[PDB]
Design a protein around this nucleic acid. Structure first.
Ligand SMILES: [Mg+2]
Ligand SMILES: [Mg+2]
Ligand SMILES: [Mg+2]
Ligand SMILES: [Mg+2]
Ligand SMILES: [Mg+2]
Ligand SMILES: [Mg+2]
Ligand SMILES: [Mg+2]
Ligand SMILES: [Mg+2]
Ligand SMILES: [Mg+2]
Ligand SMILES: [Mg+2]
Ligand SMILES: [Mg+2]
Ligand SMILES: [Mg+2]
Ligand SMILES: [Mg+2]
Ligand SMILES: [Mg+2]
Ligand SMILES: [Mg+2]
Ligand SMILES: [Mg+2]
Lengths: 324, 103, 51, 145, 119, 138, 177
RNA sequence: AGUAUGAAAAUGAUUAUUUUAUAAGCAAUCAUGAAUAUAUUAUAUUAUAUUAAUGAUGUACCUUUUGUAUAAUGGGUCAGC
RNA sequence: AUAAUAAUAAUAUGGUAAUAGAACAUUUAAUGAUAAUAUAUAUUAGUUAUUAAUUAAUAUAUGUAUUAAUUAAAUAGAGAA
């Protein structure tokens, strides 16, 4: 009685259960149920759908399997079904996250420049942040071999609750770390898992409640801290401020000395104000007149760009970035 | 065998990666440089600890025999031969007044 | 007393150049001196505004 | 706001209002609407088709706006005043204008009304000037070539 | 008769509130560390602060002993219960060989200010 | 002109949704050794079922290994706490289990006096500036 | 004037001059219940607080606009100008025409040494910035003066080089705000 | 005074990180900046470890005595007994 | 009518000479699975209210415990001669 036949049966069964992802088997996965309750997923999101989110489009193995001596071994995953992977869910999650985050940031800061808006959107939904969110949620990657799972006779309900994709065993062993595409990166897989979860939440909830994918996104993404002031870097804010005042109906900005102490010293203090007529548009401090002037101009620009409107206000649409 | 640390302590592939990294980087390792292996299309990014960096660079280890002296006597000259070039240190030992200098 | 003297010799074309590179990187990493620098306000907050 | 949507950044050196944020927001909203349209017309397998890509591609919007004859009301700077306007990057300008309309609708009237508008006159099958029709023409041309 | 529009119309707000008379000054999202073990509230539960002393913006402030609950909303979420680092001290006298070891590992409760706003 | 400095947002558990810090607990016992009697009889004393029902967001594992009995709790932040429950009874094992459940996995730390609020937010009232102050000095 | 709250300042039961930082006094202070106005004793150089946004930078719809928060404590009459441009002191002028602009260009390309930016500015009653705007020097001239900069830099010592890099980083930190 | 092994301490030289040439006492504790190192959830405005900026507090240990920092007894250090 | 754990109210918890309870480390004898995916020892970093054990990584030796636990006993714990 050969053990190779038993291993063949185990491998075929694992492949079949990953191809079909039946609910009868997926609902016994402690990882999936614990994750479901932890994230408060809707009660009508099936454990099979959650496992579908976890699984990735790993259909055909690469040719670099043939060369483990060259620094790459893939002996952890089984081929998936082209119609039961998470590609479309990943795309849908990308779309939803991009739209919602961009809309939220804009409505919070109507006047953000495009570059800063893009930077903030990345700060919120980048690949690294999504991977961190996945690992924080508990999404854990399958690293053991199918043969090892056979040897210790592991049920497939445990594998169905683990992130699955072509991951390189031997990745950083001995400090080699052969480079690969994003199809063999754990970070990208984790981000795909998060986006697929978002997409599944929407897919199941849109009909009854158009919202609640957006509420999930506000709960788990837009709740994250981000100081928008730390995303700016100006060059010639004096010129930019003059152009902004000219574009608007404001009187030309003139910088003036409001206070001074410690002149003729290592570290003096000068307080300057950029007046537009009688109205102070920016307040700057510095150890030099030039420093104070620059700081006042930058302060005025930031007040302008980062102005946040009340939620009860009529929507504000900016005239575009100040172009000089 | 008479060979350097990089040649004695590394597997062949790791040796090729390290040598290529040093060649691209000017003669010494750097943290993050995707290296291209010759006559092959695969690229790598070696990762090492500072102990590995220090031990893999070329160096030669010399030991003396049983010398009749004291540590306090040897230090007087070994503190002069601190980081000098070997040729300069040899000249200093040639023209020193101390018995330890010959050895 | 009997002693022994041991030596490790290295190369100016690898070790010293690498050390110079590292020193250069540390120099570039060194933070600038700001006259009115954002020196942290040391001490616990106390649970009240002092300004 | 309509004029801001119909004025491009290249006009008057950006001194007067222009449409970049509206363009981006409308592009994202329209991409999401087209993705859900592909889903509905359930099956997560039609999200990477050439038809899906062309449904948002810039050329589609440029042709849409040309047939809808909104061109003369658009403010922008012709690179070379006297020469075929194709070389002057008019596809990008008019795609930006259409996306700006989408974004302005979304910001001022709301997501529900914007979705109704985009699923109505736009993105229709029985209009003969809709993005869907333009996409079928483009995919047919690609197949022919 | 307590006008609060200046605090209503403000993108940033801070609150000084007291637990067992100990005051804490917090803003939306801050992380409070009570130096004791809360047995009334389990992890994941939400506390409605009902002893708020001050509600402030950059230039205006409302003071109450306590402030009326209807005016504001301050909710915290208990995130964990943990302990301080273990320490041991040797209590002993000048010419005594005997040393008594006094061991200390206190309890802490972590709170996250989930929502702070004026109603 | 304006450029952007790339940044990444900082998570704030509890501001929106709350994710329970404890994700998984592992109860390791031995079939041989008096140090594991408490764990064995806890495992067979109809209590782990109540724990599972009460905390459906925690994954409970039961394992056998030669050695002293262990409780292995892994948390969201990536850290892990191991407690050896050798020669403890049902109630003391339960107390250790409650301790592991009821805690974030952060490294135990020593705090100064009145160091009880940690903030990522800037000050609503900016820092005191001697030039901008209600009362000028002398 | 819109709000008639009593005005108060951060008070300490102790002596503020000698015990500015002792937190117990602030803790033990007791104000009467009610609203108060206490201005922030800080500079608004890096703030985006609604209470610090200027009125002209807010939407007209903003209710916060009518309210008089960003107090105009200072008056522009008494504050002297800082690093102000000559045109800003006495406004800009638009008086040169194409022919003299072209001849300015010819002089600049002919003899940049003799016809410097300041010389042309004095001759034509314009600013050196305008001279640079309209004209352009010779490639040989820019090359030789770049070489001069290179020589001056090369003659530096270690400390001055580090100090100049420090100046560059500090100046970059000015604009981050 | 068997054999083999032996990153056990005292002890010596050298290297690395950090502090140190206007500062004074059991050499340590607390408070608090700064440099460096490690970290496969540092998402960071992160954590930990090492280190004589600076501040406060602090009269080695046993024995024997009414009573000892005591300039009263005993101890160069470590390993084994 | 007990035992364990937990909860509330109240009282008490400095200590030389001295008295009275309890426990831990080491070794030996009786009973005693398991096993290189393990055991023992050492270093670093974490956990348990911590003279003790434990988890991870690394290094050496070993197909391996007088092992976990209960008893019985000590050449059973050293900065003090
Ligand atoms: Mg003592
Ligand atoms: Mg005494
Ligand atoms: Mg005093
Ligand atoms: Mg000094
Ligand atoms: Mg001295
Ligand atoms: Mg006497
Ligand atoms: Mg005395
Ligand atoms: Mg003396
Ligand atoms: Mg003495
Ligand atoms: Mg003596
Ligand atoms: Mg007592
Ligand atoms: Mg007492
Ligand atoms: Mg003895
Ligand atoms: Mg001893
Ligand atoms: Mg002792
Ligand atoms: Mg002795």
């Amino acid at each position: 009685e050969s053990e190779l036949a038993k291993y063949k049966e185990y491998y075929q069964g694992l492949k079949s259960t990953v191809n079909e992802i039946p609910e009868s088997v997926a609902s016994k996965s402690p990882s999936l149920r614990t994750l479901h309750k932890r994230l408060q997923l809707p009660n009508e999101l099936t454990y099979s759908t959650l496992s579908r989110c976890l699984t990735c489009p790993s259909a055909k193995l690469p040719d670099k399997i043939n060369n483990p001596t060259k620094g790459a071994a893939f002996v952890n995953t089984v081929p998936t079904n082209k119609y039961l992977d998470n590609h479309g869910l990943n795309i849908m999650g990308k779309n939803l996250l991009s739209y919602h985050v961009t809309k939220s940031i804009i409505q919070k800061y109507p006047r953000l420049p495009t570059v800063v808006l893009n930077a903030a959107v990345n700060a919120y939904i980048s690949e690294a942040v999504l991977a961190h969110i996945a690992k924080y949620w508990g999404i854990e990657v399958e690293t053991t071999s199918v043969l090892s799972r056979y040897l210790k006779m592991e049920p497939f309900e445990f594998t169905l609750g683990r992130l699955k994709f072509f991951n390189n065993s031997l990745n950083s062993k001995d400090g080699i770390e052969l480079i690969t595409g994003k199809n063999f990166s754990e970070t990208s897989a984790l981000a795909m898992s998060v986006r697929s979860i978002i997409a599944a939440i929407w897919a199941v909830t849109e009909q009854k409640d158009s919202q609640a994918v957006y509420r999930f996104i506000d709960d788990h993404i837009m709740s994250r801290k981000l100081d928008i002031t730390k995303m700016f870097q100006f060059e010639q804010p004096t010129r930019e401020l003059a152009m902004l005042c000219r574009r608007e109906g404001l009187e030309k900005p003139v910088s003036k000395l409001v206070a001074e102490s410690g002149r003729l010293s290592k570290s003096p203090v000068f307080i300057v104000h950029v007046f537009s007529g009688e109205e102070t548009l920016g307040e700057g401090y510095g150890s030099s007149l030039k420093e104070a002037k620059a700081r006042a101009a930058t302060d005025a620009l930031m007040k302008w760009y980062c102005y946040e409107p009340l939620a009860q206000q009529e929507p504000v649409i900016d005239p575009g970035t100040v172009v000089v | 065998p008479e060979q350097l640390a990089s040649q004695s302590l590394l597997s062949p592939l790791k040796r090729e990666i390290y040598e290529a990294n040093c060649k691209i980087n000017g003669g010494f390792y750097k943290k993050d440089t995707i290296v291209k292996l010759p006559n092959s299309s695969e690229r790598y990014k070696l990762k090492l600890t500072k102990r590995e960096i220090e031990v893999l660079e070329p160096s030669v280890y010399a030991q003396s025999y049983r010398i009749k002296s004291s540590m306090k006597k040897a230090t007087l000259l070994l503190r002069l031969l601190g980081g000098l070039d070997v040729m300069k240190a040899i000249s200093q030992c040639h023209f020193s007044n101390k018995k330890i200098a010959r050895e | 007393p009997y002693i022994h003297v041991r030596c490790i010799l290295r190369t100016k074309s690898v070790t010293k150049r690498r050390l110079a590179y590292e020193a250069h990187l540390k120099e570039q990493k060194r933070a600038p001196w700001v006259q009115l620098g954002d020196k942290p306000i040391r001490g616990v907050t106390g649970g009240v505004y002092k300004w | 706001l309509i004029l801001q949507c119909l004025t491009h950044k290249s006009f008057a050196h950006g001194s007067k209002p222009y449409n970049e944020k509206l363009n981006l927001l409308g592009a994202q909203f329209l991409k999401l609407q087209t993705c859900i349209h592909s889903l509905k017309n359930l099956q997560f397998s039609n999200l990477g088709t050439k038809f899906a890509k062309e449904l948002t591609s810039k050329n589609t919007a440029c042709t849409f706006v040309k047939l809808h004859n909104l061109d003369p009301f658009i403010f922008w700077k012709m690179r070379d005043p006297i020469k075929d306007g194709h070389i002057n990057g008019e596809t990008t300008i008019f795609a930006s204008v259409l996306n700006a309309f989408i974004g302005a609708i979304l910001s001022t009237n709301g997501s529900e009304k914007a979705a109704k508008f985009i699923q109505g006159s736009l993105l229709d099958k029985e209009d003969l000037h809709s993005l869907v029709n333009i996409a079928n023409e483009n995919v047919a041309s690609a197949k022919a070539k | 008769k307590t006008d609060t529009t200046p605090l209503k119309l403000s993108n940033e707000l801070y609150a000084i509130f007291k637990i067992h008379n100990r005051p804490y000054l917090v803003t939306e999202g801050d992380r409070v560390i009570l130096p004791f073990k809360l047995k009334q509230a389990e992890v994941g539960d939400i506390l409605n602060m009902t002893d708020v002393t001050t509600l402030g913006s950059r230039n205006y402030k409302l003071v109450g002993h306590p402030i009326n609950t209807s005016l504001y909303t301050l909710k915290a979420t208990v995130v964990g219960k943990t302990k301080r680092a273990f320490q041991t001290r040797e209590v002993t006298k000048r010419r005594n060989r005997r040393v008594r070891h006094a061991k200390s590992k206190g309890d802490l409760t972590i709170l996250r200010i989930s929502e702070l706003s004026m109603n | 002109v304006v450029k952007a400095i790339a940044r990444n947002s900082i998570g704030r558990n509890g501001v929106g949704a709350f994710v329970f810090p404890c994700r998984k607990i592992t109860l390791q016992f031995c079939n041989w050794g008096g140090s594991s009697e408490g764990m064995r009889k806890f495992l067979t004393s109809k209590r782990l079922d109540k724990w599972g029902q009460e905390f459906p967001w925690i994954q409970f594992e039961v394992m056998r290994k030669s050695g002293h009995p262990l409780l292995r709790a892994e948390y969201t932040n990536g850290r892990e706490k191991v407690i050896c429950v050798r020669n403890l009874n049902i109630d003391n094992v339960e107390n250790k289990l409650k301790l592991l459940k009821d805690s974030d996995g952060d490294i135990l730390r020593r705090r100064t006096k009145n160091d009880n609020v940690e903030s990522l937010n800037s000050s609503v009232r900016g820092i005191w500036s001697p030039l901008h102050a209600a009362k000028r000095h002398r | 004037k819109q709000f008639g709250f009593p005005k108060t300042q951060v008070t300490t039961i102790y002596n503020k001059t000698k015990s500015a930082s002792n937190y117990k006094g602030y803790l033990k202070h007791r104000d009467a219940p009610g609203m108060y106005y206490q201005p922030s004793e800080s500079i608004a150089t890096g703030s985006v607080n609604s209470e610090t946004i200027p009125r002209s930078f807010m939407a007209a719809s903003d209710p916060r606009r009518g309210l008089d928060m960003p107090v105009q404590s200072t008056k522009a009459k008494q504050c002297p100008n800082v690093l102000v441009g000559k045109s800003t002191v006495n406004g800009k002028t638009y008086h040169l025409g194409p022919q003299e602009i072209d001849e300015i260009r010819k002089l600049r390309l002919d003899n940049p040494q003799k016809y410097t930016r300041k010389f042309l500015a004095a001759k034509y009653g314009i600013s050196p910035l305008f001279v640079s705007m309209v004209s352009k020097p010779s490639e040989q001239h820019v090359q030789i003066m770049e070489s001069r900069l290179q020589e001056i830099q090369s003659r530096w010592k270690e400390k001055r080089r580090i100090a100049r890099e420090d100046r560059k980083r500090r100046k970059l930190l000015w604009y981050q705000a």
